[PDB]
Amino acid sequence: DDDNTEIIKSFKNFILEFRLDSQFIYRDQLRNNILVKNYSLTVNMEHLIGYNEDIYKKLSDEPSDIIPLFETAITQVAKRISILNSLPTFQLILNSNANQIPLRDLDSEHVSKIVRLSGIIISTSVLSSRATYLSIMCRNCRHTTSITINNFNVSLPRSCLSNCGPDPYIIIHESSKFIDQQFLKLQEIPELVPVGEMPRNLTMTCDRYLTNKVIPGTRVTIVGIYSIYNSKGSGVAIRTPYIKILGIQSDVETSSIWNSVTMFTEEEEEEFLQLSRNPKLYEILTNSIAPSIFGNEDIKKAIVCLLMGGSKKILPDGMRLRGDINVLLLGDPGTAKSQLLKFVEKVSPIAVYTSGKGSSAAGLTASVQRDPMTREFYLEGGAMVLADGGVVCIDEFDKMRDEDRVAIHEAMEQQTISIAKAGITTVLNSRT
Amino acid sequence: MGYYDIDDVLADGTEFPCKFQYDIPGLGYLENNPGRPITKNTKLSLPLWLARILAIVGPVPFVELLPPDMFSTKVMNAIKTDPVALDLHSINSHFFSLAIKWIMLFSEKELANVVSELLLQRAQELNHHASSLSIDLNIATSTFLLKLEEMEKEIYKKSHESYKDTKRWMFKK
Amino acid sequence: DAVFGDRVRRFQEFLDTFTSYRDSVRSIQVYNSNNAANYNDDNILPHRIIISLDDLREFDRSFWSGILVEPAYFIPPAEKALTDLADSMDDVPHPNASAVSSRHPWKLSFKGSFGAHALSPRTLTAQHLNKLVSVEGIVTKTSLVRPKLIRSVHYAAKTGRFHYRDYTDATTTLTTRIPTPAIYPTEDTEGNKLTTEYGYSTFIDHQRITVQEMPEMAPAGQLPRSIDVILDDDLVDKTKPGDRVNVVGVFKSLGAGGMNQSNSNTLIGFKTLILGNTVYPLRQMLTDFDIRNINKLSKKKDIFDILSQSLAPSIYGHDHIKKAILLMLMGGVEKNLENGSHLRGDINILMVGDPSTAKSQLLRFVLNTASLAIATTGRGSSGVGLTAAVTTDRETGERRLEAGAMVLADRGVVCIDEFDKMTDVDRVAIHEVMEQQTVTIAKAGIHTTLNARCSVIAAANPVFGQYDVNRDPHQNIALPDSLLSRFDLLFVVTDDINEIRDRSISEHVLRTHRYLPPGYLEGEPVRERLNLSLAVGEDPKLVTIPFLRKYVQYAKERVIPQLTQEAINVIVKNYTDLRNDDNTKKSPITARTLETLIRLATAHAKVRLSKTVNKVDAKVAANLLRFALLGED
Amino acid sequence: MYGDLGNKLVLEAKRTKQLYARSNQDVNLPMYHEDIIRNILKEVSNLRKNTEYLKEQQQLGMLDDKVAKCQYFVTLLCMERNKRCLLAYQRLRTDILDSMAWNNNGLDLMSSITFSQQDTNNLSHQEQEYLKEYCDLITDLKSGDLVDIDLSGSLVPPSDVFIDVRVLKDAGEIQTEYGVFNLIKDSQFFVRQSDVERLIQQGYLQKI
Amino acid sequence: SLPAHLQQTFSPEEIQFIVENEPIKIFPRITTRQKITRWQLITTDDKALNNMVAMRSTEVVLWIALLLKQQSKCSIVAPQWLTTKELDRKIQYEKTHPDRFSELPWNWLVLARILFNKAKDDFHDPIHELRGKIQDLREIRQIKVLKGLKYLNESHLQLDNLSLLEINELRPFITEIMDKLREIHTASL
DNA sequence: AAAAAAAAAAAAAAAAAAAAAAAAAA
DNA sequence: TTTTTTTTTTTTTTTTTTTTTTTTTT
Ligand SMILES: Nc1ncnc2c1ncn2[C@@H]1O[C@H](COP(=O)(O)OP(=O)(O)OP(=O)(O)O)[C@@H](O)[C@H]1O
Ligand SMILES: Nc1ncnc2c1ncn2[C@@H]1O[C@H](COP(=O)(O)OP(=O)(O)OP(=O)(O)O)[C@@H](O)[C@H]1O
Numbered sequence A: 001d002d003d004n005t006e007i008i009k010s011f012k013n014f015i016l017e018f019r020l021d022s023q024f025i026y027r028d029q030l031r032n033n034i035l036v037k038n039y040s041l042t043v044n045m046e047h048l049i050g051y052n053e054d055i056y057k058k059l060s061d062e063p064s065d066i067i068p069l070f071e072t073a074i075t076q077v078a079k080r081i082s083i084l085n086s087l088p089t090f091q092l093i094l095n096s097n098a099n100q101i102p103l104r105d106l107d108s109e110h111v112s113k114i115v116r117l118s119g120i121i122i123s124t125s126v127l128s129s130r131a132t133y134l135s136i137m138c139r140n141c142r143h144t145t146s147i148t149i150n151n152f153n154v155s156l157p158r159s160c161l162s163n164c165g166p167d168p169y170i171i172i173h174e175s176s177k178f179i180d181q182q183f184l185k186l187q188e189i190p191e192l193v194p195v196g197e198m199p200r201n202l203t204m205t206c207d208r209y210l211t212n213k214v215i216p217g218t219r220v221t222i223v224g225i226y227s228i229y230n231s232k233g234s235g236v237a238i239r240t241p242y243i244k245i246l247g248i249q250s251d252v253e254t255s256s257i258w259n260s261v262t263m264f265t266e267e268e269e270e271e272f273l274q275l276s277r278n279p280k281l282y283e284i285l286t287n288s289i290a291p292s293i294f295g296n297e298d299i300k301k302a303i304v305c306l307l308m309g310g311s312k313k314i315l316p317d318g319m320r321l322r323g324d325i326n327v328l329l330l331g332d333p334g335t336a337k338s339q340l341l342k343f344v345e346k347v348s349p350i351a352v353y354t355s356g357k358g359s360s361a362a363g364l365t366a367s368v369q370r371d372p373m374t375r376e377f378y379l380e381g382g383a384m385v386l387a388d389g390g391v392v393c394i395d396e397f398d399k400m401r402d403e404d405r406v407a408i409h410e411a412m413e414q415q416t417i418s419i420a421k422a423g424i425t426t427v428l429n430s431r432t
Numbered sequence B: 001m002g003y004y005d006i007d008d009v010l011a012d013g014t015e016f017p018c019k020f021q022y023d024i025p026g027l028g029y030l031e032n033n034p035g036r037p038i039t040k041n042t043k044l045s046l047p048l049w050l051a052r053i054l055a056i057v058g059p060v061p062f063v064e065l066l067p068p069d070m071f072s073t074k075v076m077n078a079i080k081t082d083p084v085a086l087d088l089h090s091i092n093s094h095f096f097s098l099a100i101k102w103i104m105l106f107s108e109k110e111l112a113n114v115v116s117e118l119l120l121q122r123a124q125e126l127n128h129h130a131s132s133l134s135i136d137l138n139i140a141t142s143t144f145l146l147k148l149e150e151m152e153k154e155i156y157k158k159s160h161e162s163y164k165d166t167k168r169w170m171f172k173k
Numbered sequence C: 001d002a003v004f005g006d007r008v009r010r011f012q013e014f015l016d017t018f019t020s021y022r023d024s025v026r027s028i029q030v031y032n033s034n035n036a037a038n039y040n041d042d043n044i045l046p047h048r049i050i051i052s053l054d055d056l057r058e059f060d061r062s063f064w065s066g067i068l069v070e071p072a073y074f075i076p077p078a079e080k081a082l083t084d085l086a087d088s089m090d091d092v093p094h095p096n097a098s099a100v101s102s103r104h105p106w107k108l109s110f111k112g113s114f115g116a117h118a119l120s121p122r123t124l125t126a127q128h129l130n131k132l133v134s135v136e137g138i139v140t141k142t143s144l145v146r147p148k149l150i151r152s153v154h155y156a157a158k159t160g161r162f163h164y165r166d167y168t169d170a171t172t173t174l175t176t177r178i179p180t181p182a183i184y185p186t187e188d189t190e191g192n193k194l195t196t197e198y199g200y201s202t203f204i205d206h207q208r209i210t211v212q213e214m215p216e217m218a219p220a221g222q223l224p225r226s227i228d229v230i231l232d233d234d235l236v237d238k239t240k241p242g243d244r245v246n247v248v249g250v251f252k253s254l255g256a257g258g259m260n261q262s263n264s265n266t267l268i269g270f271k272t273l274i275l276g277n278t279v280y281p282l283r284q285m286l287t288d289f290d291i292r293n294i295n296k297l298s299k300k301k302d303i304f305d306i307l308s309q310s311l312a313p314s315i316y317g318h319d320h321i322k323k324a325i326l327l328m329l330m331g332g333v334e335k336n337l338e339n340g341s342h343l344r345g346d347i348n349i350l351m352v353g354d355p356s357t358a359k360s361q362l363l364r365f366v367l368n369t370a371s372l373a374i375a376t377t378g379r380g381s382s383g384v385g386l387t388a389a390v391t392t393d394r395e396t397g398e399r400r401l402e403a404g405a406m407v408l409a410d411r412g413v414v415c416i417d418e419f420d421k422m423t424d425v426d427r428v429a430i431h432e433v434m435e436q437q438t439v440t441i442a443k444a445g446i447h448t449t450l451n452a453r454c455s456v457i458a459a460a461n462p463v464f465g466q467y468d469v470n471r472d473p474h475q476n477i478a479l480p481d482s483l484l485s486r487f488d489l490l491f492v493v494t495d496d497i498n499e500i501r502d503r504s505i506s507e508h509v510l511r512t513h514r515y516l517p518p519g520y521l522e523g524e525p526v527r528e529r530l531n532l533s534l535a536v537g538e539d540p541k542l543v544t545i546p547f548l549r550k551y552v553q554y555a556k557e558r559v560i561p562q563l564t565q566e567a568i569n570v571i572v573k574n575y576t577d578l579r580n581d582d583n584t585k586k587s588p589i590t591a592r593t594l595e596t597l598i599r600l601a602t603a604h605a606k607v608r609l610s611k612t613v614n615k616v617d618a619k620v621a622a623n624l625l626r627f628a629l630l631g632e633d
Numbered sequence D: 001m002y003g004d005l006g007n008k009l010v011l012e013a014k015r016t017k018q019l020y021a022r023s024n025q026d027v028n029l030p031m032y033h034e035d036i037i038r039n040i041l042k043e044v045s046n047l048r049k050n051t052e053y054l055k056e057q058q059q060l061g062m063l064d065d066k067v068a069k070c071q072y073f074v075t076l077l078c079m080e081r082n083k084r085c086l087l088a089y090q091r092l093r094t095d096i097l098d099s100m101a102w103n104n105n106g107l108d109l110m111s112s113i114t115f116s117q118q119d120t121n122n123l124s125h126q127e128q129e130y131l132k133e134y135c136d137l138i139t140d141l142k143s144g145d146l147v148d149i150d151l152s153g154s155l156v157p158p159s160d161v162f163i164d165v166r167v168l169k170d171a172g173e174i175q176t177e178y179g180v181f182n183l184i185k186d187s188q189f190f191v192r193q194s195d196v197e198r199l200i201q202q203g204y205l206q207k208i
Numbered sequence E: 001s002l003p004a005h006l007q008q009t010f011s012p013e014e015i016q017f018i019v020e021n022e023p024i025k026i027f028p029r030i031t032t033r034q035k036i037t038r039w040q041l042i043t044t045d046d047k048a049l050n051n052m053v054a055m056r057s058t059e060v061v062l063w064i065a066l067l068l069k070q071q072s073k074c075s076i077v078a079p080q081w082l083t084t085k086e087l088d089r090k091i092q093y094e095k096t097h098p099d100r101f102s103e104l105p106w107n108w109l110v111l112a113r114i115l116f117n118k119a120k121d122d123f124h125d126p127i128h129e130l131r132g133k134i135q136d137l138r139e140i141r142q143i144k145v146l147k148g149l150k151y152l153n154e155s156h157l158q159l160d161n162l163s164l165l166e167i168n169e170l171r172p173f174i175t176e177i178m179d180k181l182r183e184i185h186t187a188s189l
Numbered sequence F: 001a002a003a004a005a006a007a008a009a010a011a012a013a014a015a016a017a018a019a020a021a022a023a024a025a026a
Numbered sequence G: 001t002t003t004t005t006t007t008t009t010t011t012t013t014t015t016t017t018t019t020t021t022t023t024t025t026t
């Protein structure tokens, strides 16, 4: 406790005395965040290194132990610059510019160390509840007690405080506080997989203000801590590794629910409206489609039209009208048909590229699976579910089996997928 | 009473329910029925620049103004329960101007006690979101500015611009 | 202690401030009392009232805020005060044999505006725990109803007195207490043997339902999420799978949440549940104005044409199919006959036609306008998914059955799209449902017959891309004859190129595509999001759709016409003329055409709001079937 | 019904106001709306014909007076609404024109050298005339009693005696009071602020 | 006037102009005493400027002082309230009374910024400490303004000791909110 | 006589998806 | 003759929970 106090003091002085030019940036960010009810703080590591190298060295070697001290320093500063108290413990989000480590280069040498890596999100779980403030009572003497928990990896006391039993204590669920927990699954970048190896996956955990931030198929950059948890596999003394997320950078501006709101600052909106006023914007957009392909101007114009898309209408009688464009290319070999499909995948914010030979109706529309634990049936998305609000590029379309190809008829026009299997009867949206 | 105000002109063109109290031939383009004359006790939605005057000239006037859908008991209860979270844009894009207009035509002290409280409680959130100047080194603002009336956007823009100019002058190096 | 009594006093004052609740209590009390006095009986109203949160908001802001924010400390004080008031009202004594032991305490329900507490199973997070919320969704699964013990009474020999033990559970009460082992006492305090006396104890019915988010409101690329609700006492069996419901209750945590003797793990969290107070279905009750308007509009001569044309005003043409759909909506009268038989009253329609002929946009309209409708696609369905599936009940442990598409639409309609693309193994099951209207399950020790009385409308495509007039009808349709015989009306529709038709239909389509919803500016994208404001208050001429729904409901529930001789005379002559002719029809004519004429005549009689079948009904049925079979129009 | 078209015109005005409100630099007015205006002119002419017809039909005495009063009032109100919409649109466009005319140091605007902010053909002929007399009014204001003060000068307070400036466009030698400036492109000057206000305003210099 | 708003609110530069139109004290490094070209100003008294002696205290208008310090002929003495002691006294007064504003001059922010920019050498205390103290005061004043904004009505408000820049940055919101409230109240009469 | 520790108790199974054979036909 | 069609064949258990009732062990 005689070192934790000095650590908290050092962090508070960093927050309150850092200045560049003529503005306390980290003091102003806290006040601006408090006004819009954002209880968090983002710190760049380069500033921390510049301020004092000892503070950075303390954090770099003991993250799980030091980070909560910075967490409480932030909320001590906030109550001073906001109040002369329903302020929960704040959150720290970190930014780093260090070298990125591949997933397959992570091993026993990197345990309990902060790392930076990139990958592809393949699945997002549901939100779960974790306790922070626990109200506790004993089964016999019946007196009140409290416990405070931080999520940086505790149990009820195996005793009694004031005969009572061994560990007699129950949780009073009312007057207890909880936060949001989410689990995500990662995968390697397809071009970084070694020779003859299948891609591997990893598990990550996010908390509080970093939940509902990514969607499956997204390419992201993750800053977090590489840790292990004992659980459960006949090996002796083996543990399972995972990553606790501290910072997320995502290419797609869309959040989990795609709020359909502007995420553009005025500095970019001005650029976009200036671009829109160009008298020859059509030619500029057309010339940007696959600049390494000669000719084929009409196909590129069609691709631009498909990328922008039409309008969608709803009528009083419940009718729905499609507002998306579908394009077919039936031609001779060697005419760059397959080099435009992979370009449309890159340019589109949301896009999936599939082959007709290696495909199936379940893989394209939706599948039904059985949970090993619960032993019930649930629905899992497919190619047309992932590529919602985007584009799906189906190559070798003529080689598709006749059973699999007919499953796309409803999704192409009615933009819905009807499943009536195993006691599950639902209709899912698919606008692609 | 601004003749050249654009927003007043727009807000004055909204449609209000009303009932004809007489029987008169020659009309019908109000109903989009050219040849058909209008009957007695007919309920139509007429624009405000017409229904306001038709309810004054007669004695009993030619037309009676019916209670609007935007001033029902449900909307008042929703306003009273939670002022900030309510989406006034969906109810009507010109809620406040029509509110003062309705108070002026029909003296209603109850509505004047509710609209004032609604405005006073939303002003605090407006100021909180306007004062939050970003620093280079949220979902709340985007969500809130989509629930703003036409009048409140002007105040938000003015406050935001003033704050940005003050901050710019303070930190000019 | 003191706060409990103060809150009881506050609620007691609230109760005599507004006299409506006191009158409802008395009405329920007198009903229950004078019902038991009717020895020559011809049933029991539960002890539950619905109070408005709005009125409490004007009365006491602090108490309203406490209920909305901290329900677990303000609802139990209110329930005791309500019980006290109800006990005070009941002046008449009730020296019942065993009602003295079980009081059946009075409970509360809420309505009004919830402000920011109106959410969905997706926007519900850890910030809403221990709060009063309302969630809107669709019921998917329900558990079996079981009885749960609340108090046990035991008799002691050699002394003659009784002793009672109380039991509580986490789901039973809103406050955490010391748990009970649910083991009956056997020894008295003095050691005398205790005997359990069933019939004086208290048991309460318990059920668990699952409510899923509406799939139309889900974000892009995401699957809908679901939550669990627990119902008890009088709230049991008020919902069925597939229903759209709105449940108001307390969002609660439960368990130990892995913070205990078990090993530390990051994958372990707490469990969340809702103790539902009220359930509201999102049957349109009709007033005298609506009924008078219906009776006035019935007497108009050209009512059938108006009613048929009002269907799907965004479709150009297809008048006869729109008449057939309307006749489907008002089904025929089912006749129960000896030998355990029933003549079906449903009308089944099949549409075969060319691509892009508005076949699939009528099924979607039937999905919306009808009271009950289930949508199905040929390739994305299975036999076990249409009839029933064997599953397990996690809460209790037995093995049970889960309903499929056909049985979920009892007294409803099923709309099947891409009907020809369905596999043969899938197509046999629908055959049986089309014939017996019953499902037989003989799997895993569950031998049961399930009722499925649904109307089928289907759309398909010919064997080739387009209909061929130079080939026989059976070659064009790949469906077997046995399946094809079970449809009352088969409509073959063809797109023919004609300049005037193209000029009219293109004008209609271009007019449709230029529609702007009110409150939207030009170029403004449609914001089909509602901004999380689910609801504001928690509970030639054409006709509007709700009026049509009221008309259909009233006709289905209020008129049952009977056949007459003079209509039979027309039906028999039409049947005899149709049978003995050399015209080549697209479908064979058989002895089941007479039943189709009878059903169509009965439906047209229902449309007219009459109790007899007239000659005009027979003429309309004859014209419709002549158009269907021949195209003579 | 009758005025429903004019509302559209008002809507257009609103959009223009936004371009006026969100303007870091001076902007140009969009195209005139002579076709919509002519449509309101046609419909108000038809309303005048209807009022005339009502006048004769009443003065032959076939219709009740109370009946005729209603359509008379309706036609009058529709004409008043159309007048209001047209006048509001015209006044907004006039205000923007006045602002630009003031923000070019007087001068004759389009006839002489202009800052290329506005194209000739956007404005209507009557607007082009109005701009000319307004510019002449500014001119004979600037020669009034306030000769010493430049009424078309800069409106930002002076707080820096000596400034650094950079040339944007090439030019020749220009004489100034007691000296000469040589405008070689891509060259920097350190000189008093008062001398170069004119040249900065006309785009031959950068920075301050 | 007309362009860039400016209809009914002052820009920060005009506030700076008004601030620089105020006197300040200096220590001349030159002697312009008359012997035993002259200034002859038209908006400010030139008696002190004409009669100047080195290493003596005189007072002139602020902008002339800045122009002189642009050369090497002046040294401006910061006001006595620009000290760590006098700032800590005001911070304590600000803390103890949470319902009134401390008595600071109506140009403290503008004067502090101008003096920090121009006359950095003249301060006796380290400049970073004073810069931190100014922010410490501003944050508390902002908290009090945020709390006081809740009591808006149609009659009148009183802001006894609010500074010029603080009033300027808040005028458009306050005036328009009270104007709308006043119209709503007037309509119901 | 009174503590701390350690197991029993599982059960269950249909319903769907993917891949390779061994019989049918334009 | 090379195409379509067709049956059909394992796929399943590795996990769970807090009481309740037993043996050891100070
Ligand atoms: N017009 C072109 N400009 C540039 N490269 C071209 C062009 N046409 C073909 N190519 C090149 O030809 C090669 C093969 O083209 P690609 O793979 O796109 O063929 P394809 O049209 O998909 O053929 P297939 O019908 O056989 O599947 C690539 O290297 C591509 O760059
Ligand atoms: N008569 C019509 N009136 C209006 N729209 C029509 C009509 N016929 C076709 N359409 C339009 O054609 C489009 C496709 O129609 P729809 O999906 O109902 O066809 P379908 O018969 O189901 O086709 P498929 O054979 O391809 O499954 C829709 O946009 C629909 O509005």
Ligand SMILES: [Mg+2]
Pocket (backbone or CB within 6 Å): A337, A338
């Ligand atoms: Mg290819």
Ligand SMILES: [Mg+2]
Pocket (backbone or CB within 6 Å): C359, C360, C417
């Ligand atoms: Mg279709």
Ligand SMILES: [Zn+2]
Pocket (backbone or CB within 6 Å): A138, A139, A140, A141, A142, A160, A161, A164, A168
């Ligand atoms: Zn104890």
